[PDB]
Amino acid sequence: ADGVGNASGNWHCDSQWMGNTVITKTTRTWVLPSYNNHIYKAITSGTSQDANVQYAGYSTPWGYFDFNRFHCHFSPRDWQRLINNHWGIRPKSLKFKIFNVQVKEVTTQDQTKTIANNLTSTIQVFTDDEHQLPYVLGSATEGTMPPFPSDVYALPQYGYCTMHTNQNGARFNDRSAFYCLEYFPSQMLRTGNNFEFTFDFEEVPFHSMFAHSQDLDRLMNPLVDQYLWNFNEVDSSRNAQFKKAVKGAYGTMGRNWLPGPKFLDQRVRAYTGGTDNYANWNIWSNGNKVNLKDRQYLLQPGPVSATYTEGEASSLPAQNILGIAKDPYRSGSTTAGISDIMVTEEQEVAPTNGVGWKPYGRTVTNEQNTTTAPTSSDLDVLGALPGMVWQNRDIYLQGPIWAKIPKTDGKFHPSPNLGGFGLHNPPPQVFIKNTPVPADPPVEYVHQKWNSYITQYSTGQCTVEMVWELRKENSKRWNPEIQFTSNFSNRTSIMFAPNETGGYVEDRLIGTRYLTQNL
């Protein structure tokens, strides 16, 4: 294909806007180590007796590419052009390349590393097109490409969980599956070789890049009464009374449509002002949980809900938020306060979704009679009922693009709770390993497992090219709308740029919902 002295690819980063489509291209330099030192390891939770944290699986010698966050594909300026001018976006097609491969050997002598080119060494690359391997993308995990184009990123090690059991610690059982990645055809690359593949997204709904400019309970003409007559009260004579729904009677009016279903969330005050928190409680005791088998885990974030009520504006739904550290590299060994963490604000869905820590509503709790007074209480958690409408969670420049829909007999509204595009056929996983280069063999043959290798690592460039379909904003609104703008003011470095020491700084989460549209 190509020799030692020719480049096998070129650098491509741009965004192209044509018609109803935008094409993003981005190139990175990647680094791949040799993971596990060329073996598979059965990994578990060990002696841990807590069923909730138990797991069983395998770490592999293979690495992988994760481009599943938007800021991989969009500059902040391009994200601005997207969210200010368009009502919708969905992924269409994908092209991925690996080129300019460099395999290097590391030799240590007397605490002295020397790095040299190994020109005859290979890397192996394959994509899993039929989704025959455990799919670890779409879990919102690190190891994604860094947003900034000149940043290098080490490829994460591939591993997976498989079925486990609880007896005196995690154990594999008969349903536990092992996957050898060397049991798949992969092409081998020396420095001259390159790799590419293409992918087409299935048809999915456009993400809704707008906020509603109307509330689900305001849909009627304010100037006219309804012709409906609703039950009002029972008179002292015990006879039922009916009241006409009249203009301004909004509490009593009959409606065709209901807010979407929701869990109840606990409210926390994350910002200055408003109703203050109770002290010394953790979400693990008091939060929403999911029972699965013998295990519990916190239900986070669940379907999206409105973030706050006005006047309570500093409060958050505890578990309904996506937190992201302002410093991507901040260590998770210690907790952080609100000042260190970017938290998503879902207020755009307030017209249809209801606020997270508000109950869905009230429910009648009894059947009344002459001697039984009517009673009612809160409806905290409610499933789907005919007439409900809701919005999905917003997508963020720093958030995940897609998630793989689990393969199941049934689903309800398969929109991922973390946000993004639910896909029956997500983009295939791209696996990469350094081909093992054995060390010096013994002169006299011995029967043993081969543990001796030359230390290798590889580096190169990768281009990701995505095509995005757009819905144009079409609106007769007379007055100006809300736009995302730079209101950062005076700074010691440019926002969404490198700082003095070269660290890339994105301290603000950016959603898509700025333009408005009627219900």
Place this chain on the structure above:
Amino acid sequence: PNLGGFGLHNPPPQVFIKNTPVPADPPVEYVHQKWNSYITQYSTGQCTVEMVWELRKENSKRWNPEIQFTSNFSNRTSIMFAPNETGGYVEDRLIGTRYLTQNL
């Protein structure tokens, strides 16, 4: 369906069968009454049911062996899923379909 199986808007049609009434001896002099007199009839025959089933082939890269349904009944006085000494057909074990595994 909660009991399991395939929910169908248009299920296989119901097949109805009756023995045609064969009236008994009528009265020589006509009388106006409902006719209750019949010759006792019954019928027998054979019926074939032919069904076509569409299958999805197992496609898996799993390295290790999987779970299979097998005969582990051991030593018995009659064959399992067979007739016994008096000819009664014996199926004492429920058998589901879920043995092969697949990732989520």
Place this chain on the structure above:
Amino acid sequence: ADGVGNASGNWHCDSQWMGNTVITKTTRTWVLPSYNNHIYKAITSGTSQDANVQYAGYSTPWGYFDFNRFHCHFSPRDWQRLINNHWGIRPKSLKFKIFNVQVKEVTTQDQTKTIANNLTSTIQVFTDDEHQLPYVLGSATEGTMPPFPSDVYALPQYGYCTMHTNQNGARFNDRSAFYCLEYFPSQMLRTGNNFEFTFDFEEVPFHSMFAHSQDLDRLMNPLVDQYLWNFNEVDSSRNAQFKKAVKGAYGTMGRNWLPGPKFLDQRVRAYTGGTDNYANWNIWSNGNKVNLKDRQYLLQPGPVSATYTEGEASSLPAQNILGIAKDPYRSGSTTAGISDIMVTEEQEVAPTNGVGWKPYGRTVTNEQNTTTAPTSSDLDVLGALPGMVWQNRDIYLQGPIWAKIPKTDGKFHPSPNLGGFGLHNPPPQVFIKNTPVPADPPVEYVHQKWNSYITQYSTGQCTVEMVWELRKENSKRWNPEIQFTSNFSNRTSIMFAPNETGGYVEDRLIGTRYLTQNL
């Protein structure tokens, strides 16, 4: 196909001799009962604790046709034309018909049976072409067609043995297979319907219809010496001496060929004269046995051996014989003497096979030296060695035609020990049942197994047409040969004919080996 008042077939019995082939046709009337009363029964050896007699299997409602004896297809006169004029025979093709079917119902009232035609009732018939059912033909069991054409024969009930285990009696295990014969496509016949199928035999060796006129040790010219010099003796001086094999030295001559391999058999005197028997011993204690799993059983009859030495002519090899009762219907509840039993005489194979109760020969038992004298003993039992030649067992007018070769990785000379033609693909089994006719059902539906049936039985005619390939006798022998002839003399009924009460009498076994041929 046909109505109530038309015959669906005609009677065919003849033998046609054309060229190198003979075609036999024969027709019988058959009777089929309803076996088991329309159920399958799991059958075992019961509480029997003797491992040797244990079994497990199933009896079926089905019957079957067994034509696997020669006297089904050959009249005694045709058998005579065969054995006097031909050197060989093998089966070529087969045609079988069932026609003129009559299904009848039996009604018992007050110990009075009435039989009536049931015109709408059916029988079911199928052949197992792919040999997917346990093959019970070729075991030399009763239920074959009777030799005589006007005799009716009830069809035997079909059953089979399947794998069993020994624990506290016979048990089925996981390798035990059940076969539902209603799980096979079968055509259903009313009185107008008929059935047929054709079959082709695979190429097999011609049976050898001749006896050798030479002995395996006489093959040389008596007028000339050999040029071979054989070790003779060791002189008193300890030096070896060599002797020339000279004309008349037959004991000392070198030969190219060896008699066939054999088991040693015990001799019994079955006829008047010769060396008399020891008293009060049974073959079960003293005979040849086979160990199979935890079981023993008598090795009978094993490969064929010569029946006797001259001067011992009244003796038999105990287990190497085929006995057949002169009265086919004699009950097996009591033992019989030689006068009641026809016993095969294999003397034609004496040139190559050696006599059953004679050892194969002598063997040197030691390595001699100056202080060790040579020793030798009998070689009783010997397997196959390069240079052995042998004859198979003869076929008899009253004996089996074929046997199914077991399906195995390996075989040695797959000629059946009972005689006949070993076949990888034997003629298919023909299964027949009376279709169950249910009795009066209950007016009010009840959930129960249906045990109520109308008693049915069926009868009809069946034609078997076989084509046989022949080898013509070609011989330059000047003097007359041995022929099979009628030397019965004066009798109260014709031999191979009915007697005064109509019983068909064949009291003499007839082999095929009369013509002679050189080795």
Place this chain on the structure above:
Amino acid sequence: PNLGGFGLHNPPPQVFIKNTPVPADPPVEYVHQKWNSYITQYSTGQCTVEMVWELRKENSKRWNPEIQFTSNFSNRTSIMFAPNETGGYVEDRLIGTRYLTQNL
């Protein structure tokens, strides 16, 4: 073969591989001697083996279920027929071919 497998008059050919000797520095003045001086070499690479196997399909009228090879290993600290914690590949069970049954 007594050890099992397929006896072949013409078995697959033996594949021989050597590292070509690379001689070391020769003497400037020619000497007559056997050459014992070499540069230490070893080689590595990849090899693919592709075999085609002919099969006979199971054809059986047996009504009851048969014996199948299945995973009945139960709970383990590593997957059976997989690597363990230290990466060693573990096959602790011999597996024959004879599970399906057939009449004699």
